[PDB]
Design a protein around this ligand. Structure first.
Ligand code: F1Y
Ligand code: K
Ligand code: K
Ligand code: ZN
Length: 357
C-alpha cells in the first residue's frame, strides 16, 4: 500500500568533461527529485536507500571483461578516459561513472527487494546513468550496465529462477541490451515501444523491428512495437497498450513489473521528437498497476528535457501513490502508420498469445 522512492545525490558525479551541455546532464535526476518534493509526493513515499551493486551482481548479465574495463575507468587520466569512451557508441566516461552505475543498479536492487518482501507495494527509481542500451559485453548509448535486466535477474536470484518478470520499455529508443539479454529466455517477457522509422532512428538497427519475437525457448517473449511516420502521442501509445501490451501482459501473468521508464518520447524532448504528455504517462502507469498485484518498479532511463521528465515521472509517482488518473485529450484517431505497426506486431505474435487471436 506504500510507494518506495530511491534517489541518491551521489549519482550526479558522472559527467561529460569534454561537453558540458551534453543532454545526459546530472541535473536530470536532481530536477525530477526536486519536483517530487515540491508537489509533496516525496512526503507520501517510503525512502529506499541507495547502495552499490556488487561485481558478482553485475555478473548476472555482464561478462567479467566488460566489468573489469569499466571498473578500470575508476582510476584513469582524462586522455585515457577519452580513449576508452571513443571505443563505444555514444559513451562518455568520467572517473566517477563506474560508481554511479553501481549506485543505479544497487538502488534498483533495493527497490526490487522492498517490493518482493512486502515492505512496499510499488516503487520508483530516480537513477542515472541509464541502462537499457548496455549489453552483456559492451557499453552503448549513455549506458554502462543494464539496470533493468540486472534487476530482473536479481529479483529471480532472491526469489526463484522461474519468477515471471515483465519488462516494459517505453523509452523512445529500442532497448537492444535488454532484448539481447533476454532473447532466449521465457521467464522474462520483454515488451518495447520505440521510434523505428525503418532503422533510421537510434540504435539504427533492424533488431528493433516487429519480427524479432525471441529465439528458441524465448520465442514470443520479445514484443517489439516500432513506430514509423513522424510524431506519435498519447493516442498511439494508448492503442498499443490496449491491443498489445496489456493483453499479452495479462496472459503472461507476471509477478514483478519493471518499467524502463525513459521519458524522451515526451513533449518537448529534443532527441525523441514525440509528444507523449505527462497525463498519458500517468495512464500507462495506471494500466500497468493492474498487473502482478501492483508490484511495479519504475526505473528512470532516458529523457532530456528537465521540465518534461520532472513532470512526467512525477505523474507516474502520483499514479503509484494511488491518485486518480487525469482525464486525457480526445485522441482523435491514430496516425495510419501506427495502426499498421500495431497490426504488424499482432500478426507477428498471435501464434504465441491466444488473447491476440
Ligand atoms: C544527442 C547526443 C548524441 C547523439 N546524437 C545523435 C544523432 C542521431 C542518432 C544518435 N545520436 C546520438 N546518440 C544517442 C545515444 C543514445 C541515446 C539515448 O539512449 N537516449 O535515451 C540518445 C542519443
Ligand atoms: K523502448
Ligand atoms: K524474453
Ligand atoms: Zn532513449
Amino acid at each position: 500500500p506504500i510507494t518506495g522512492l530511491v534517489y541518491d545525490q551521489r549519482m550526479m558525479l558522472h559527467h561529460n568533461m569534454w561537453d558540458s551541455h551534453h543532454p545526459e546532464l546530472p541535473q536530470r535526476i536532481s530536477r525530477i527529485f526536486s519536483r517530487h518534493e515540491e508537489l509533496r509526493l516525496l512526503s507520501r513515499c517510503h525512502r529506499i536507500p541507495a547502495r552499490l551493486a556488487t561485481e558478482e551482481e553485475l555478473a548476472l548479465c555482464h561478462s567479467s571483461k566488460h566489468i573489469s574495463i569499466i571498473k578500470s575507468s575508476e582510476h584513469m587520466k582524462p586522455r585515457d578516459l577519452n580513449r576508452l569512451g571513443d571505443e563505444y557508441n555514444s559513451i562518455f566516461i568520467s572517473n566517477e561513472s563506474y560508481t554511479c552505475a553501481l549506485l543505479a543498479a544497487g538502488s534498483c536492487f533495493n527497490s526490487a527487494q522492498a517490493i518482493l518482501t512486502g515492505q512496499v507495494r510499488n516503487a520508483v527509481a530516480i537513477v542515472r546513468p541509464p541502462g537499457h542500451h548496455a549489453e552483456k559485453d559492451t557499453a552503448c548509448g549513455f549506458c554502462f550496465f543494464n539496470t533493468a535486466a540486472l534487476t530482473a535477474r536479481y529479483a529471480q536470484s532472491i526469489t526463484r529462477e522461474s519468477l515471471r518478470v515483465l519488462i516494459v520499455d517505453w523509452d523512445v529508443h529500442h532497448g537492444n541490451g535488454t532484448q539481447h539479454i533476454f532473447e532466449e529466455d521465457d521467464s522474462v517477457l520483454y515488451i518495447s515501444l520505440h521510434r523505428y522509422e525503418d532503422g533510421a532512428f537510434f540504435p539504427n538497427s533492424e533488431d528493433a523491428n516487429y519480427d524479432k519475437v525471441g529465439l528458441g525457448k524465448g520465442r514470443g517473449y520479445n514484443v517489439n512495437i516500432p513506430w514509423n511516420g513522424g510524431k506519435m502521442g498519447d493516442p498511439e501509445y494508448m492503442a498499443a497498450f490496449h491491443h498489445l501490451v496489456m493483453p499479452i501482459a495479462r496472459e503472461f501473468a507476471p509477478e514483478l513489473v519493471l518499467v524502463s521508464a525513459g521519458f524522451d518520447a515526451a513533449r518537448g524532448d529534443p532527441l525523441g521528437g514525440f509528444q507523449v504528455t505527462p497525463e498519458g504517462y500517468a495512464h500507462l502507469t495506471h494500466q500497468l498497476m493492474s498487473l502482478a498485484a501492483g508490484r511495479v518498479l519504475i526505473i528512470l532511463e532516458g529523457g532530456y528535457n528537465l521540465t518534461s521528465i520532472s513532470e512526467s515521472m512525477s505523474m507516474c509517482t502520483s499514479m503509484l501513490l494511488g491518485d486518480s488518473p487525469p482525464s486525457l485529450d480526445h485522441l482523435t484517431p491514430l496516425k495510419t502508420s501506427a495502426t499498421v505497426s500495431i497490426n504488424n506486431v499482432l500478426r507477428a505474435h498471435a501464434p504465441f498469445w491466444s488473447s491476440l487471436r
